[PDB]
Amino acid sequence: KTKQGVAEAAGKTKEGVLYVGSKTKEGVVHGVATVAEKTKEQVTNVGGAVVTGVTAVAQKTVEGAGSIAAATGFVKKDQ
Amino acid sequence: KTKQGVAEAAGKTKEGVLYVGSKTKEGVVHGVATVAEKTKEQVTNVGGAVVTGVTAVAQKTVEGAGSIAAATGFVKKDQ
Amino acid sequence: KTKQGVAEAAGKTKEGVLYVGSKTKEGVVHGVATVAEKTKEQVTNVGGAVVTGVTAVAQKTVEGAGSIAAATGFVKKDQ
Amino acid sequence: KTKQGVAEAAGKTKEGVLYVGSKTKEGVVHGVATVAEKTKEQVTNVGGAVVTGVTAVAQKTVEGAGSIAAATGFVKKDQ
Amino acid sequence: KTKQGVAEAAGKTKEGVLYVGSKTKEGVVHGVATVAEKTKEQVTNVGGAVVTGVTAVAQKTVEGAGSIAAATGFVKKDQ
Amino acid sequence: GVVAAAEKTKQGVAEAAGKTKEGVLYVGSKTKEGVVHGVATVAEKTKEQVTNVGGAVVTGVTAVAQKTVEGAGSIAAATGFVKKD
Amino acid sequence: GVVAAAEKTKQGVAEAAGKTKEGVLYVGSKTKEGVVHGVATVAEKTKEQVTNVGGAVVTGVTAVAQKTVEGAGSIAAATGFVKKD
Amino acid sequence: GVVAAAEKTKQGVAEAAGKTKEGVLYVGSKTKEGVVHGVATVAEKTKEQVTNVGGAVVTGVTAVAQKTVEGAGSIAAATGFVKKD
Amino acid sequence: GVVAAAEKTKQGVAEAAGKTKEGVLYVGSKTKEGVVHGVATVAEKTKEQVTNVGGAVVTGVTAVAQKTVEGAGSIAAATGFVKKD
Amino acid sequence: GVVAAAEKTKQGVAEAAGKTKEGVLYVGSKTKEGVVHGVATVAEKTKEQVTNVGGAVVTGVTAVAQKTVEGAGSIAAATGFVKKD
Numbered sequence: 001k002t003k004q005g006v007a008e009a010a011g012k013t014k015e016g017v018l019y020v021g022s023k024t025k026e027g028v029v030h031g032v033a034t035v036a037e038k039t040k041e042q043v044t045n046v047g048g049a050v051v052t053g054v055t056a057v058a059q060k061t062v063e064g065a066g067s068i069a070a071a072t073g074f075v076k077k078d079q
Numbered sequence: 080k081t082k083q084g085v086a087e088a089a090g091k092t093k094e095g096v097l098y099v100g101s102k103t104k105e106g107v108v109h110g111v112a113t114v115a116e117k118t119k120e121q122v123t124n125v126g127g128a129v130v131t132g133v134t135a136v137a138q139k140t141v142e143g144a145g146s147i148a149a150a151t152g153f154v155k156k157d158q
Numbered sequence: 159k160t161k162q163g164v165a166e167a168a169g170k171t172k173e174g175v176l177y178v179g180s181k182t183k184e185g186v187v188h189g190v191a192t193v194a195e196k197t198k199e200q201v202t203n204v205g206g207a208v209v210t211g212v213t214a215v216a217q218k219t220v221e222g223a224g225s226i227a228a229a230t231g232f233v234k235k236d237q
Numbered sequence: 238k239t240k241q242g243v244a245e246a247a248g249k250t251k252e253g254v255l256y257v258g259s260k261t262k263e264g265v266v267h268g269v270a271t272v273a274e275k276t277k278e279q280v281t282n283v284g285g286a287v288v289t290g291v292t293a294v295a296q297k298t299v300e301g302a303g304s305i306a307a308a309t310g311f312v313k314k315d316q
Numbered sequence: 317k318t319k320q321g322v323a324e325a326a327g328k329t330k331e332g333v334l335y336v337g338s339k340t341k342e343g344v345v346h347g348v349a350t351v352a353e354k355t356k357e358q359v360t361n362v363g364g365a366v367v368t369g370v371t372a373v374a375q376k377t378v379e380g381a382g383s384i385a386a387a388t389g390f391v392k393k394d395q
Numbered sequence: 396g397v398v399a400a401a402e403k404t405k406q407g408v409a410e411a412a413g414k415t416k417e418g419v420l421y422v423g424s425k426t427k428e429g430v431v432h433g434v435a436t437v438a439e440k441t442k443e444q445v446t447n448v449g450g451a452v453v454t455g456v457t458a459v460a461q462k463t464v465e466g467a468g469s470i471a472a473a474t475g476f477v478k479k480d
Numbered sequence: 481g482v483v484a485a486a487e488k489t490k491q492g493v494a495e496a497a498g499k500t501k502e503g504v505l506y507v508g509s510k511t512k513e514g515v516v517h518g519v520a521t522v523a524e525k526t527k528e529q530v531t532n533v534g535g536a537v538v539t540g541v542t543a544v545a546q547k548t549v550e551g552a553g554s555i556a557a558a559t560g561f562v563k564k565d
Numbered sequence: 566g567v568v569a570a571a572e573k574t575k576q577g578v579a580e581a582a583g584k585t586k587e588g589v590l591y592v593g594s595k596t597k598e599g600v601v602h603g604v605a606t607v608a609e610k611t612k613e614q615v616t617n618v619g620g621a622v623v624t625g626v627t628a629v630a631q632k633t634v635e636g637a638g639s640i641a642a643a644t645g646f647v648k649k650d
Numbered sequence: 651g652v653v654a655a656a657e658k659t660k661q662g663v664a665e666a667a668g669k670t671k672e673g674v675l676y677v678g679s680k681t682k683e684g685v686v687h688g689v690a691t692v693a694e695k696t697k698e699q700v701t702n703v704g705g706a707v708v709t710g711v712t713a714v715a716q717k718t719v720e721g722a723g724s725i726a727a728a729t730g731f732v733k734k735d
Numbered sequence: 736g737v738v739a740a741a742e743k744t745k746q747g748v749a750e751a752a753g754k755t756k757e758g759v760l761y762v763g764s765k766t767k768e769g770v771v772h773g774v775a776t777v778a779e780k781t782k783e784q785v786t787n788v789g790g791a792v793v794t795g796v797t798a799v800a801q802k803t804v805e806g807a808g809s810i811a812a813a814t815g816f817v818k819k820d
């Protein structure tokens with residue numbers, strides 16, 4: 001037997017009100033807020049990569065080796 | 080046996096009100112907010128990549144190796 | 159036996175009100191909001207890629223290796 | 238037997254109100270806020286990588302070796 | 317038997333109100349706030365990497381050797 | 396006098412505003428005004444006797460949520476001789 | 481007098497504003513005004529006797545949440561002779 | 566007099582503002598005004614007797630949350646002869 | 651007189667502001683105004699007798715949270731002859 | 736007179752401000768104004784007798800949290816003849 005990332009809840013009663021709940025979060029992006037007010041941005045690009053926005057990436061994988069969740073704003077010239 | 084990312088809930092009663100609930104979240108992007116007010120953006124691009132918007136990516140995979148969830152704003156010139 | 163990303167809920171009673179619920183979320187994008195007010199955008203592009211909008215991608219796959227969920231705003235010139 | 242990252246809760250009563258709950262968070266990005274007001278940004282790029290935005294990456298993997306969660310703003314010229 | 321990162325809670329009563337809860341956090345980034353007001357940034361880049369934004373990365377892995385959670389703003393020219 | 400000009404350009408934007416007043420805006424926000432959440436009551440053997448003569452009585456398990464803009468919110472009001480001239 | 485100019489450019493933006501007043505804005509925020517959360521009561525054998533004559537009485541398990549803008553929020557008010565001229 | 570100019574450039578921005586007044590803004594924030602959270606009461610054998618004549622009485626398990634802007638928030642008010650001229 | 655200029659550049663920004671007044675802003679902050687949290691009461695055998703004549707009485711387990719801007723917050727007020735001219 | 740200039744540059748920023756007044760800002764901060772936290776009371780056999788005539792009485796387990804801006808916060812006020820001219 002093997003348990004990994006398991007949320008367990010048990011409750012027992014005879015008379016009254018009983019509440020049982022279980023929650024699980026794996027690879028979750030929650031609550032991203034961005035505000036830009038009266039912002040000046042001047043970009044001159046020649047063959048490059050420029051990133052100025054908002055990026056939110058959430059990845060969950062099982063039995064995955066070598067995976068990349070995010071790769072933002074890069075120049076790759078492998079030979 | 081093997082349990083991975085399992086949410087379990089059990090409840091028992093005789094008289095009254097009983098509530099049982101279970102929730103699971105895997106690779107979930109939740110709550111992304113962006114505001115731009117009176118923002119000036121001037122972009123000149125010659126053969127490059129420029130990203131200024133909002134990107135939200137959520138990926139869930141099983142038995143997947145080498146997967147890329149997001150690749151935003153890049154220049155690739157592999158030989 | 160093998161359990162992965164399983165939400166389980168069980169309830170038992172004799173008299174009264176009983177509520178049982180189970181929810182599962184895998185590769186889900188939820189709640190993306192964007193506002194642009196009085197925003198000036200000037201873009202000059204010559205052979206490149208420019209992205210300024212809103213992108214929301216959700217991907218769920220099983221037994222998929224090398225999959226890419228999102229690839230936004232890139233220049234590819236592989237040889 | 239083996240337990241890893243397991244949240245367990247148990248409750249028992251006879252009469253009254255009983256509440257049982259369990260929560261689990263693995264690889265979760267929560268609560269990212271950014272504000273830019275009256276900000277001036279001038280960028281000149283020639284074959285490089287410039288990143289000025291907001292990046293939020295959350296990755297959860299099982300049996301994954303060599304995985305990279307985030308790789309932002311880099312130049313790679315491997316031979 | 318082996319327990320690692322396990323949150324356990326148990327409660328027992330006869331009459332009254334009983335509350336049982338368990339929480340677990342592994343590889344979680346919480347509460348990142350950044351404010352830039354009237355900030356001037358001038359960047360000239362020629363073949364390099366410049367990073368000025370906000371980066372929040374959270375990674376949780378099991379049986380993963382050699383994994384890199386974040387690699388921001390670097391130049392790699394391995395031979 | 397407010398003047399905005401743009402001459403001899405390739406892409407030009409010229410905006411002029413005399414007076415401007417911004418407003419209220421919500422983006423991905425949650426609000427709760429006058430909200431009752433999660434009330435649980437258990438009673439086994441309760442004896443209640445009420446003798447009310449010309450008054451307001453509130454008895455039992457009561458869960459009241461009120462949201463008022465230009466009025467009054469009351470639960471029990473035993474008044475008299477209310478006049479507006 | 482407010483003047484903004486931009487001449488002999490490739491990309492030019494010229495904005496002029498006389499008077500500006502910003503507003504209220506919420507981005508990914510949560511608010512709670514007058515919220516009752518998580519009330520649990522257990523009673524076994526309670527005896528209650530109420531004799532009310534011309535008054536306001538609040539009895540029992542009471543959970544009240546009120547949110548008022550331009551009015552008064554009251555639970556029990558036994559008044560008299562309320563006039564507005 | 567407020568003047569902003571930009572001449573002989575490739576990318577040029579010129580903004581001029583006479584008077585500016587910023588506003589209130591919330592980004593990823595939580596607020597709690599008048600919030601009652603986590604009230605638990607256990608009673609076994611309680612005897613209550615109330616004899617009210619022309620007054621306001623609050624009895625029992627009471628959980629009140631109030632949020633008022635331009636008014637008064639009261640729980641028990643036994644007044645009289647309220648007039649506005 | 652406020653003047654801002656930028657001439658003979660490749661990337662140029664020129665902003666001029668006469669008068670500026672910043673505002674209030676919250677970023678990733680939490681606020682608690684008038685909050686009651688975590689109240690637990692246990693009573694076994696309590697005897698209560700109340701005889702109220704023309705007054706305000708608050709009895710029992712009471713949890714009150716109030717947040718007022720331009721008004722008064724009271725729990726028990728037994729007044730009389732309230733007038734505004 | 737406030738003048739800012741930038742001439743013969745590659746990247747140039749010129750900002751001029753006559754009068755500036757900063758505001759209040761919170762970044763990752765927590766505030767608690769009028770907060771009651773963690774009140775536990777245990778009573779076994781308590782006898783209470785109250786005889787109130789034209790007054791304000793507060794009795795029992797009381798947990799009150801108040802936050803007021805432009806008003807008064809009172810718990811028990813037995814006054815009379817309140818007038819404003």
Ligand SMILES: Cc1cccc(C)c1NC(=O)Cn1nc(Cc2ccccc2)c2ccccc2c1=O
Nearest residue numbers: 465466467468469472473474477478479551562564
């Ligand atoms: C709630 C309650 C119960 C029992 C005793 C009382 C005093 C109250 N309070 C109020 O009625 C508050 N009020 N008063 C007035 C003015 C008015 C009232 C009665 C007769 C003539 C004029 C009013 C007018 C227009 C729209 C709303 C309202 C309002 O809401």
Ligand SMILES: Cc1cccc(C)c1NC(=O)Cn1nc(Cc2ccccc2)c2ccccc2c1=O
Nearest residue numbers: 465466467469472478479551552554557559562564
């Ligand atoms: C809540 C309550 C219960 C019992 C006893 C009292 C005194 C109160 N308090 C109030 O009624 C407060 N109030 N007063 C007025 C003015 C007014 C009241 C009555 C008659 C004529 C004029 C009012 C007018 C318009 C909209 C709201 C309101 C308001 O809310």
Ligand SMILES: Cc1cccc(C)c1NC(=O)Cn1nc(Cc2ccccc2)c2ccccc2c1=O
Nearest residue numbers: 550551552554557563564636637639642644647649
């Ligand atoms: C809550 C309560 C219970 C019992 C006894 C009292 C004194 C109070 N307090 C108040 O009514 C406070 N108040 N007063 C006034 C003015 C006014 C009141 C009554 C009659 C005529 C005018 C008012 C007007 C408009 C909107 C709100 C309000 C308000 O809220």
Ligand SMILES: Cc1cccc(C)c1NC(=O)Cn1nc(Cc2ccccc2)c2ccccc2c1=O
Nearest residue numbers: 635636637639642648649721722724727729732734
């Ligand atoms: C809470 C309470 C209970 C019992 C006894 C008292 C004195 C109080 N206190 C107050 O009513 C405070 N107050 N007063 C006034 C002015 C006013 C009051 C009554 C009649 C005519 C005018 C008022 C006007 C407009 C909006 C709010 C308010 C307010 O809040």
Ligand SMILES: Cc1cccc(C)c1NC(=O)Cn1nc(Cc2ccccc2)c2ccccc2c1=O
Nearest residue numbers: 720721722724727733734806807809812814817819
């Ligand atoms: C809380 C309380 C209980 C019982 C006895 C008293 C004296 C108090 N204190 C106050 O009412 C304080 N107060 N006074 C006034 C002025 C005023 C009051 C009554 C009648 C006419 C005018 C007021 C006006 C507008 C908004 C708020 C308020 C306020 O809050």
